[PDB]
Amino acid sequence: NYSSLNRAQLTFEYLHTNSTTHEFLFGALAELVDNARDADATRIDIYAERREDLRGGFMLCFLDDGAGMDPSDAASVIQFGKSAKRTPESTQIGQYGNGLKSGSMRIGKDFILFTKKEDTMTCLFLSRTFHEEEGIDEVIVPLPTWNARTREPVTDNVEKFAIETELIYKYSPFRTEEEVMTQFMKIPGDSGTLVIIFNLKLMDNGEPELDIISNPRDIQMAEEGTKPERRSFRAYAAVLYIDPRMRIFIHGHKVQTKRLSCCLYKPRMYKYTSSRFKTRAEQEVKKAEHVARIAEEKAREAESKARTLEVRLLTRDSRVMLRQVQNRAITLRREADVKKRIKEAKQRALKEPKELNFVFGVNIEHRDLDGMFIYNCSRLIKMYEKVGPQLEGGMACGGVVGVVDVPYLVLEPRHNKQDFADAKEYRHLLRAMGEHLAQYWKDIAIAQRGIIKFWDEFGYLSANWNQPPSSELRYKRRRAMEIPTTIQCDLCLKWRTLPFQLSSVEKDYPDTWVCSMNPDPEQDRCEASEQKQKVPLGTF
Amino acid sequence: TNYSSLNRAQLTFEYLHTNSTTHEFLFGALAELVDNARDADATRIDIYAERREDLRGGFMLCFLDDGAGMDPSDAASVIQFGKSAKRTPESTQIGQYGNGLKSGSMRIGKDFILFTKKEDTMTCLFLSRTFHEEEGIDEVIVPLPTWNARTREPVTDNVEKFAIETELIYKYSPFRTEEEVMTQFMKIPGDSGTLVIIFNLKLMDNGEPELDIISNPRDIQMAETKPERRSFRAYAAVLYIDPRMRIFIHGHKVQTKRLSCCLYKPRMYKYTSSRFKTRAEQEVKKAEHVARIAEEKAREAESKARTLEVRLGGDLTRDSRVMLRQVQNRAITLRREADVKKRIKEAKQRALKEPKELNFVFGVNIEHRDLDGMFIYNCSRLIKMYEKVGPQLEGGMACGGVVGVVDVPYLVLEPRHNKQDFADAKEYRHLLRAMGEHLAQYWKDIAIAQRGIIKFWDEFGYLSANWNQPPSSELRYKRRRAMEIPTTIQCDLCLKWRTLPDTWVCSMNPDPEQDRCEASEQKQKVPLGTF
Ligand SMILES: Nc1ncnc2c1ncn2[C@@H]1O[C@H](COP(=O)(O)OP(=O)(O)NP(=O)(O)O)[C@@H](O)[C@H]1O
Ligand SMILES: Nc1ncnc2c1ncn2[C@@H]1O[C@H](COP(=O)(O)OP(=O)(O)NP(=O)(O)O)[C@@H](O)[C@H]1O
Ligand SMILES: [Mg+2]
Ligand SMILES: [Mg+2]
Ligand SMILES: [Zn+2]
Ligand SMILES: [Zn+2]
């Protein structure tokens, strides 16, 4: 019994410490978007709610229709490091048990979260304002739960519930039970979550870091020196995931999420055999083989004992002791059989090709927006990273975008999910990408016809590399014929391609598009199987 | 109200790993522990290996300092994540986030055990992830036993607890008996100091430790390019802009240095920072509001005291008397509170009139022309190195070889979580541009073109055509280079920095004015340039 011993504890100032991991502010917002994706949301709405009485003048709200949280899931939010996602073979992005807390506290002083699942609804309130006003150095978190149908309190301690809710009514943006219930009503389905960050951080000039006024369909950094994804959250959100499904809306307006590899001229894929991937997968199998073997030894020991003890023995004493070893044998056999299945699954996975897929294509719409985009378990970590020939002063590989998805066995992310924890191996990957890039440039052979004429044809008349291509009617169409338009159905979440349509070059597409708007007979119903847009194979 | 029934946020075992992922640069994890020794006023830190083939990686990494140490309550606050007494106004401590020892140690190894002594106590703090894994503990449980430094009796309010704590140490730590633990405490020889031992070190895929102490037995190298990114001896030498604390690796002194003293024709440019000014102005306006409120409170309480005295005038009762002193003393306390705040307001007002300037220093690295660029310190601590700025961002020889140094106060920039970057990238980028413009000016000012840039480098013995190769080692070029760089050296005894016209001490100096440890320390006279 260790109950008397000292525990490590969190103090109030740690919330700030933790938040300093995010220099890139959009990386803090990404943590909340990641959590919605991980909860299987089909949509997330990121929107502002004007509140002149709160610091920065609005609250930033993240509303998803994912799985939500029951009361124990909600309580675990404040167990720093706790993540039910951290399982071997995770394709969830979350693994460190920190993102919501590091991200929210970078963005604002306070947050309040509402979540609904099955028959309960829970509020989690993290108020640094309360802590400062009352001189609290611990981290104290109100966590009231109500019945989702009756709205009655669900609590073991009515005095605690009254203190919890009064703290919410005193310090949060919602000053009555009725105002709180209005927030729970914004989660219209059976389940979902609403995170509201408020008292937003200010710049020196007293204005918020986030500008939602300049473009009321966007969230921008309040300050072109910058790539679009570093100043426009609409741009960043579109490419945050390599395989988007979840729809994203900003201030009610759909984000045109995209697969970068489908937005490029003449995409090509190269398989890179990864010695780390294979080495590490082998070591994982060996660990699981060991674990399974030891569990089998222990089960066989207990099974032997049950056999031998039974023959040796009927008093009630001997009956109870025989059953105790018989049940122990049964328990250990079931555990040994579970470890065996884990090991066998890992053995099967080991035989899959241990390769990374590099995809390259030319960004003819914005040739200055080039370099490598490096994803980790499908989540964007690094963008616009120049490699190989791009590191020289040349036109060689100018305009080429590269994409790769790196599994957790090959690389894990830093604390802020904007870098890689193993710099040596990351640099090795960049070197390999650079070599394959050079091969790509040979394989499309622009030198054959020239580069001065290639770019001229898509409307790049200026000698200013970073100037946009011509806007005229012939050049827009010429670029449009090379990159098929793809679009996601708002109903079924399938991705579809649209045949070129000269009447469609003039416009873009509304907040809604559905499969039955498609003119291709082969993909005009939600029922038509999703066609995988496939990338020709190159060799290095 | 009373909040005792309300939920608290808590730390779980896995968070120790999460926190450690901040340190991609492994030497930055080691630097956290060096910082703590510096902050504790250590005059010496020994970073050394103790061989232990039974522990993962084959050795334990030890950090032994002669700093102030920790009393038992100081030691207990180590595991209060975020707690930092160092977080004070005009704090010149590196520590501010209440995290570094925990993030750094858990990047380097699985487990650590710390021994510390201060006055008549000595405390062990044991963070064993091996224990947590073996017994399936999901909280973070930390033995913290204290003994009397002189008698070696336990100092504990709960002997049952103390027995459990020490039994955990003897079971899981590198030291299996009380005698072995006492041996570690005895490695702190003075009245105070701290020994941090990190063990079960992380391994690479090939089963070798990340830290290579074999290739060079006087160094700690990365087992895998700027010297400071592979040699800890190199990195430690430039970790602080104003080194005093001596650093030893495996018992061998590190030649710490002030980068501005190692360069040809160093020059200083003062840069007026609007950010610095505005933030200082706001820190004052806050202090003046705080002193204002306190004054009005004191003035009301003094008024009440006076009025109650005239009203009670003529009352003999014990009651009226005791009550009159409750009010009088309350007035006295508020007055002293108001006066203290008024003093801090005044001190911030005085500091506001100091110049709000950053000092950029540039000089030419004639010994190693390819090791150039800017070194950016934050309250004396190195954050970024070899950062190219201004004309260095071109493919030219202009400003090639120039090293720049600046110390940036917390008011202007604060560090990221891992102290290897800056929290405000916009402001950092602005600083780099300003440094670039001043670098161009420095280059004009030393007039390397008056003599010819090619001939300048020839004279110091750069025979080779490729920028990367070192200059010639012939004797005439060695002396040509050395003659341009004064020799500065630190006394092993008194810690002062000296100039001259291994072990070294003040009395070895031929300068009769610096030839004794009690002679006053001379300041670097870096000449001033203008933008
Ligand atoms: N929108 C959401 N819907 C459902 N569950 C959520 C949501 N946001 C947070 N959670 C839960 O809160 C837990 C902790 O969140 P978080 O602090 O992001 O750490 P994590 O998501 O587990 N891993 P990481 O984010 O990598 O540190 C998650 O594991 C989820 O169980
Ligand atoms: N070698 C040491 N000597 C004396 N005190 C120490 C030592 N190492 C750690 N401490 C104490 O432990 C506390 C926590 O250290 P640490 O975890 O490094 O946080 P910090 O140094 O306060 N600030 P930061 O390092 O910026 O997170 C310090 O504030 C000191 O009080
Ligand atoms: Mg997460
Ligand atoms: Mg520290
Ligand atoms: Zn559809
Ligand atoms: Zn001396």
Author numbering:
A (entry chain B): 5 to 227, 231 to 320, 324 to 550
B (entry chain A): 4 to 227, 233 to 509, 521 to 550
Reproduce the article's own wording on this structure.
The effect of T424R on the crystal structure of MORC2 is more subtle. The backbone structures of wild-type and T424R are essentially identical, including in the loop that contains the mutation. The contribution of the mutant Arg424 sidechain to the dimer interface, and its position just three residues away from a key active site residue Lys427, can be expected to alter the ATP-dependent dimerization dynamics of MORC2. This suggests that T424R dimers may form and dissociate more rapidly than in the wild type. Conversely, T424R (which has increased ATPase activity in vitro) was significantly less efficient at GFP reporter repression than wild-type at both loci.
Microrchidia CW-type zinc finger proteins (MORCs) are a family of transcriptional regulators conserved in eukaryotes. Here we report the biochemical and cellular activities of MORC2 variants, alongside structures of wild-type and neuropathic variant forms of a MORC2 fragment comprising the GHKL-type ATPase module and CW domain.
